């Protein structure tokens, strides 16, 4: 049930009840998750988007996102909407025209306008590599080999209460888990394996907010892959994975015919597992139909550590070993305030004309682009440093990064940096008071990138600020197809701008 890389993707409302709750929401495919997009290395990928939105109380406009692919001169097809392109209109379609060089791995699309993927448009994006390095650690990788992990919510995203706390109603692992409240015994997903075989599972978090504490009661769990990074096997027993993340790993089908639970504890809302909230089961083949048995631990004796995982190829780090030992090295002074985020004391409110357009009709440097202050230039060629030191409330915060992958030079609750051989990925937990989580990446990819809390609350509150990569090449870089060119006068006629 893997469509693509060519293919159509229809956008539409539906109720849906993943929890045992009715509510409308907005799909691709008919379903939450959406159906996954794939292909292999280096394909061709056409998805064409046809927005058949009519609830208004979920917007009835769509940009979609394909999270984790660097659009190498395709910088129109990245999806954030008023950074890259003007949404999709209703009744409308638009092709996704785009190639995935040198990327092979985990990733997933999703909304990017406003909160609506909250709303449910949100689905896996697998990247086959038929030459890949770990095949040998695995028997089996296909579509039941991938687990999502998402937060659901019974009130519709626009229709937060402004001022209350935003708490999530579920966690649905694979689409399906219970209510944190009136909790009723709907269905849980179901994993099966084999007893012997050993599966890549391809773990994505699709949040909106929580990060989650997941498990596999009796299993453990060899990591292989960061957010489309091949690593280094590192064992653990429990994975903390925030917003917007994903792992590889594999899972040895090793432990005696039976059903163990899979557990996503997230940082807010249900603690625990009363009623099977927060659950899925890992059924063996032959196994009785029945809710597992098994406990957690106490205490995990190998959680996931940030520091341990290492690219499985030397990737090294660009730039000199010490802080600032780049060509523009950069700290951002990241706040909260009075309902608002800012990045170097303006908070992101997204602008009428998008980035890209505002360049390539001669915006040539970034004091000139909108929104004022929230649009930084990048040198070419160039190695770029960037301190986001945490402490401002509602975090850990996962920042992610549109166009590029970053070595992870230092990680959250440790001071110490590591300029030779930390992992490379595209979201980042910045941890907790004092830390000072820093990324590092070269500029060879020109157009303007988002970077932004993968926390999609803390995004509609302004927590976020466009790279504009190369100025001066973006336009030779990206050229742009009529379809693109069509969509900001479109939507600029049916929104009476
Ligand atoms: C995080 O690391 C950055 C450097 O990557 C630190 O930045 C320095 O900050 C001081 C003032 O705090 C300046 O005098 C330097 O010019 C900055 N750059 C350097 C030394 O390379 C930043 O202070 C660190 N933040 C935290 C909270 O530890
Ligand atoms: C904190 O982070 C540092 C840097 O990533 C970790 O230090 C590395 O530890 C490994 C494993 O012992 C050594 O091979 C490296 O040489 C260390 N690198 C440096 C620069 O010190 C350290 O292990 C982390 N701390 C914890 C508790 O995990
Ligand atoms: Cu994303
Ligand atoms: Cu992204
Ligand atoms: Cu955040
Ligand atoms: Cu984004
Ligand atoms: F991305």
Redesign the pocket.
């Known amino acids: 049930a893997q469509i693509g890389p060519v293919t159509d993707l229809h956008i539409t409302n539906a109720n849906i009840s993943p929890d045992g709750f009715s509510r409308p929401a907005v799909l691709a495919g008919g379903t939450f998750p959406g159906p996954t997009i794939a292909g292999n290395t280096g394909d061709n990928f056409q998805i064409t988007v046809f927005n058949d939105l009519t609830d208004p109380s979920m917007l009835t406009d769509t940009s979609i996102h394909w999270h984790g692919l660097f659009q190498k001169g395709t910088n129109w097809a990245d999806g954030p909407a008023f950074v890259t392109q003007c949404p999709i209109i209703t009744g409308q379609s638009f092709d996704y025209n785009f190639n995935v060089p040198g990327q092979a791995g985990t990733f997933w699309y999703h909304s990017h306008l406003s909160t609506q993927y909250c709303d449910g448009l949100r689905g896996p994006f697998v990247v086959y590599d038929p030459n890949d390095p770990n095949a040998s650690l695995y028997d089996v990788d296909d579509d039941t080999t991938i687990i999502t992990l998402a937060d659901w919510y019974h009130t519709l995203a626009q229709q937060e209460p402004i001022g209350a706390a935003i708490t999530a109603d579920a966690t649905l692992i694979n689409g399906l888990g219970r209510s944190f409240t009136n909790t009723t015994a709907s269905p849980l997903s179901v994993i099966t394996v084999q007893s012997g075989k050993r599966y890549r599972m391809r773990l994505v978090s699709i949040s909106c907010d929580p990060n989650y504490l997941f498990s596999i009661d009796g299993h453990d769990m060899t990591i292989i892959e960061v957010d489309g990074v091949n690593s280094q096997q590192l064992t653990v027993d429990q994975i903390q994975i925030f917003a917007a993340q994903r792992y590889s790993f594999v899972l040895n089908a090793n432990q005696p015919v039976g059903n163990y639970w899979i557990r996503a504890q997230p940082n807010s809302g249900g603690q625990g597992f009363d009623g099977g909230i927060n659950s899925a089961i890992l059924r063996y083949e032959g196994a009785t139909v029945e809710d597992p048995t098994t406990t957690a631990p106490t205490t995990f004796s190998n959680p996931l550590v940030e520091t341990d995982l290492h690219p499985l190829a030397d990737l090294g780090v660009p730039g000199q070993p010490?802080?600032?030992?780049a060509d523009d090295?950069?700290?951002l002074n990241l706040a909260f305030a009075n309902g608002r985020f800012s990045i170097d004391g303006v908070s992101f409110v997204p602008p009428t004309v998008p980035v890209l357009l505002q360049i390539l009709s001669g915006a040539q440097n970034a004091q000139d682009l909108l929104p004022a202050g929230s649009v930084i230039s990048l040198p070419s060629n160039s190695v770029i440093?960037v301190?986001l030191?945490?402490?401002a409330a509602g975090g850990p915060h996962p920042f992610h990064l549109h166009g590029h992958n970053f070595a992870v030079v230092?990680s959250a609750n440790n001071?110490t940096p590591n300029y030779v051989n930390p992992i490379w990925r595209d979201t980042v937990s910045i941890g907790g008071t004092?830390?000072?989580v820093?990324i590092r990446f070269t500029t060879n990819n020109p157009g303007p990138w988002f970077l932004h809390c993968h926390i999609d609350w803390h995004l509609e509150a302004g927590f976020a600020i466009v790279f504009a990569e190369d100025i001066p090449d973006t336009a030779s870089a990206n050229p742009v197809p009529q379809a693109w060119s069509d969509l900001c006068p479109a939507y600029d006629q049916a929104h009476n701008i």
């Open positions: 010490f802080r600032g030992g090295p950069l700290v440093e301190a030191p945490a402490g230092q001071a004092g830390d000072n820093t």
